[PDB]
Amino acid sequence: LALAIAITALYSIVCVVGLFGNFLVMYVIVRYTKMKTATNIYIFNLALADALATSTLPFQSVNYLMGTWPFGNILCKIVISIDYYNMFTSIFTLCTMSVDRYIAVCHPVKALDFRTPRNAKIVNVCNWILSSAIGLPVMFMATTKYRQGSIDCTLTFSHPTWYWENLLKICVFIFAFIMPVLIITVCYGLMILRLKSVRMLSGSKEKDRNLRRITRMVLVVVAVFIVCWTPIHIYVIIKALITIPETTFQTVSWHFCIALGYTNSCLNPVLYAFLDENFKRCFREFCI
Amino acid sequence: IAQARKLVEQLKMEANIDRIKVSKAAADLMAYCEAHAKEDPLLTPVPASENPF
Amino acid sequence: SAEDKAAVERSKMIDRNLREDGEKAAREVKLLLLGAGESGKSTIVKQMTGIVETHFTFKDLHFKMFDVGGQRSERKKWIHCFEGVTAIIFCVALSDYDLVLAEDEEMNRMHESMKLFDSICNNKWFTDTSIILFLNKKDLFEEKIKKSPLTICYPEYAGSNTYEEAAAYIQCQFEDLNKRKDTKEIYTHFTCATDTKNVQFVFDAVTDVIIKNNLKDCGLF
Amino acid sequence: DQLRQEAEQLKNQIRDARKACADATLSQITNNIDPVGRIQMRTRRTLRGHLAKIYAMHWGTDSRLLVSASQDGKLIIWDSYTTNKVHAIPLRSSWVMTCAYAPSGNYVACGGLDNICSIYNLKTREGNVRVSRELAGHTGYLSCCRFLDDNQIVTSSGDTTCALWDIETGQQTTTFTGHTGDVMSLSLAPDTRLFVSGACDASAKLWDVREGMCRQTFTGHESDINAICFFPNGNAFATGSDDATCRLFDLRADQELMTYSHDNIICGITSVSFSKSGRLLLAGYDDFNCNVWDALKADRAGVLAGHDNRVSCLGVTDDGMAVATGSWDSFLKIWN
């Protein structure tokens, strides 16, 4: 139906934008902004996590247009583990990039000892390792099931099915939305407070222009994260609580809210690389 | 003081030297390059098998 | 290929040492101590060959202060060596306003400080460098302006011959030398004998610079 | 006042003598020789490990090992073939401007704003590089050092003097005075009996090592000379200056033979070296490139454009296989 194509297209565009933006960021980092600074390592990790997250979208896009999962059991475990894995990896990279920018500004003396590129490599690997605390269990449980004459790639839980199914959703709610928002908001909020009292951003008209720019950037990253993830996270919680009748609006909003949580992977390249000051210099060299 | 006197003595030593013409100076430099032109890896790339890099 | 393998292992081993030494050096604060002779460079060290390196730690932060007074050669050839220094500590003796350079009496040695400060502050190597300007000998300067007008050094000065206005005017004249004000900060402190205040000022100014650099590294600024 | 006037007349005499010898120009007699069309040299190695700006590099006489000196306080001996690091010597002073690899390969010399040429013994019994001798006595800054042999090293200082040192005794056997400004560069003649020093007074002085006197003074640069390299036969040298020009100077004609410059080049030359035959003059620039010059035709042969900060140092292997370019970008690149 036209709506299904529209939903499929909305998932496609989010996929194409996400991959093209993230692969571009990784490309520029590999060749121009080497993975020397801690920031670039996080940017590359965020772009890689974002790219892997959005690589699952074509399979979900096909799994929606034709109403069945034609990619088999093995891929289902991969495409759901990559989804669940790259959500927590993408979120924890943002949480690390927030804490990295917070220690930089609020503990600058300690930041020198901790913000080494080596530590960025460790914390990045630790993000991927910890994100296996959900991706691996999801990989085991992400079995393909036959239902109503069509194949559905989903998660299979243990008895009681309610307990583990909601425990995953609750843990996805706490450690992928609540803990991130508190970290991202508190870290960047405390960051802006320090910046409000720093000599090179206060005491002049033009310096205030820079501070407004940094504050706008900080607000926009928090804002984009809240606008992208909150809709789907609450929608998942409401569905797990009460039965919402399936209508032409409930379906569209649901897929839109999923599309929006994947659009944070589409926007992470722009927010953290294309609007990075270091990248603008080196990106200006990019030939196309 | 004695700095000026040294300059004259230095200049006299620098003035009393046998100078050759720039055509024999230039010809010799040209001759050296032609003689060693073949054995100059940066001029004519040697075979890739012979290049240690 | 035991010999070849040992070479790579040796190369990896010193690669680790190079990284380890770089991290130890990356966290060190590098300060370039400048100023004309008798400007208070020696005393500021006490407050904390060719180049004299002074090491001090304050509030868990390690400082490396480099004195280049013994480098009487052309500064333009070696000044770029200190590009990337955290900050420049420029010492100016406030009492120099009433004095003249010994070699030449035409130029006021306070004016020499401004020309020196102007050269360094607007140097193309220090553009994004912050200058901890230390106005030294305030006590001696205060005891002079009571019987010697600041107009001897600044003809355009039209303020009271008191420490508050006179010292402030000298501070403004040095700060006005900074052409690119927006991209460069001048942290001016009137040096005091009380301990933990001159070094505290450097720490506060350097913390601001480190945060500023962190913003550059973080890509925010 | 007679001495100052006599100096001017002697200078005019020297100008008269050189003009008399200037029967033709190097360009005139090289006009018909075949031009080196285009020199496309590629980065074959990239030496990574220096964390600061590299100020100096020096190939060893084996054309395999090279010593690079960085502001990170490290002297790194590289195996250029494998890119391996053989030694990472911790400098007692991080402010280094020059490094020399002894032709024996047993020693490297390091120096800079410490005003000291540090001599390091590479081939110690214990296998650990150690300081053998610290040459003290310059009052400016070590701008350039070169070994004549294991026991002799010639230094150029910001104090406007070059010096010959006896490493075993650590004393200056000969002092080379006459430059007005800081001496920035030093090139030993192939026979090591003469060295030419380029100073900030915009002049190059040819020195007799054994006699300890300036045989000739060369002028023509509008600004300081940061780089000076002997032509392979020792009968000429090339200078690189902040005036964005390289100049070829013939010793026997005692004058400048060629000016290597381009309108698009306005930055200073940091480094100069010749190819093995001397046909190519490689110049490192502040504009982050090295320009390959036709030494005989004063035409830009090609460009080495692999550095993101200014090329600080060049080196051509004694075998002529490769040129090493060190930059303020912390990387050495080997080119062929």
Ligand SMILES: CC[C@@H]1CN2CC[C@]3(Nc4cccc(OC)c4C3=O)[C@@H]2C[C@@H]1/C(=C\OC)C(=O)OC
């Ligand atoms: C790791 C992200 C988990 C787990 N995914 C596994 C399959 C899943 N991906 C889809 C993609 C496109 C359409 C879809 O359905 C119509 C889906 C899905 O159903 C679902 C989504 C979900 C989720 C937010 O997705 C961004 C979330 O829980 O947000 C709070």
Ligand SMILES: CC(C)CCC[C@@H](C)[C@H]1CC[C@H]2[C@@H]3CC=C4C[C@@H](O)CC[C@]4(C)[C@H]3CC[C@]12C
């Ligand atoms: C593809 C998914 C499912 C698995 C990813 C595996 C994890 C371990 C991967 C993904 C991204 C990787 C990182 C990407 C980039 C860097 C920066 C580099 O300077 C050190 C290695 C480091 C830090 C990598 C370590 C391994 C890494 C963390």
Ligand SMILES: CC(C)CCC[C@@H](C)[C@H]1CC[C@H]2[C@@H]3CC=C4C[C@@H](O)CC[C@]4(C)[C@H]3CC[C@]12C
């Ligand atoms: C960050 C901004 C967007 C604020 C957050 C908006 C949240 C609260 C919005 C975005 C999408 C919304 C859902 C969209 C569609 C439906 C179906 C309807 O039959 C019941 C409400 C319900 C389930 C909405 C609940 C509120 C919701 C989750």
